[PDB]
């Protein structure tokens, strides 16, 4: 009981593999923008102060949230790489640290372009 430390938090492993295991196919189809830009919307939807209460409210439940997620993506017009990983985020109660998983996507995307020469 004397001093206190506060380390930052970003990129870890199972959360980073969620974006790299879904965008790994996007890297071959050139969807890093289709998956990195749509995933950011999930972080803003939970970061929003009016929407943050709806995602953390105890009434959304889990089975009901699965239908609300698919019924929201239908109006959000997500991309071909954002209507599957979205369920995993709301499948096992993963809407608390969901923005940290999107940040790892930007760091993993840098490793998909560094080893891919495509300029003339």
């Amino acid at each position: 009981f004397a001093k206190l430390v506060r380390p930052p938090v970003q990129i870890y492993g199972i959360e980073g593999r969620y974006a790299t295991a879904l965008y790994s196919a996007a890297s071959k189809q050139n969807k890093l923008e289709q998956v990195e830009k749509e995933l950011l919307r999930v972080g803003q939807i939970l970061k929003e102060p009016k929407m943050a209460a709806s995602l953390l409210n105890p009434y959304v439940k889990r089975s009901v949230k699965v239908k609300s997620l698919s019924d929201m993506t239908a109006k959000e017009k997500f991309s071909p790489l954002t209507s599957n990983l979205i369920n995993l985020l709301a499948e096992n109660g993963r809407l608390t640290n969901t923005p940290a998983v999107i940040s790892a996507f930007s760091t993993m995307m840098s490793v998909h372009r560094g080893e891919v020469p495509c300029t003339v």
């Binding site: 969620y18 295991a21 879904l22 790994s24 196919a25 071959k28 599957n84």
Partner: peptide, 25 residues
């Protein structure tokens, strides 16, 4: 507690494409 995951997003990619194997069991 609420835990128990095994790279589910990785196995899901194989179901949609599954085009990368190198003798691994």
């Amino acid at each position: 507690q609420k835990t128990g995951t095994a790279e589910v997003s990785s196995i899901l990619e194989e179901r949609i494409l599954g085009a990368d194997t190198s003798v691994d069991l």
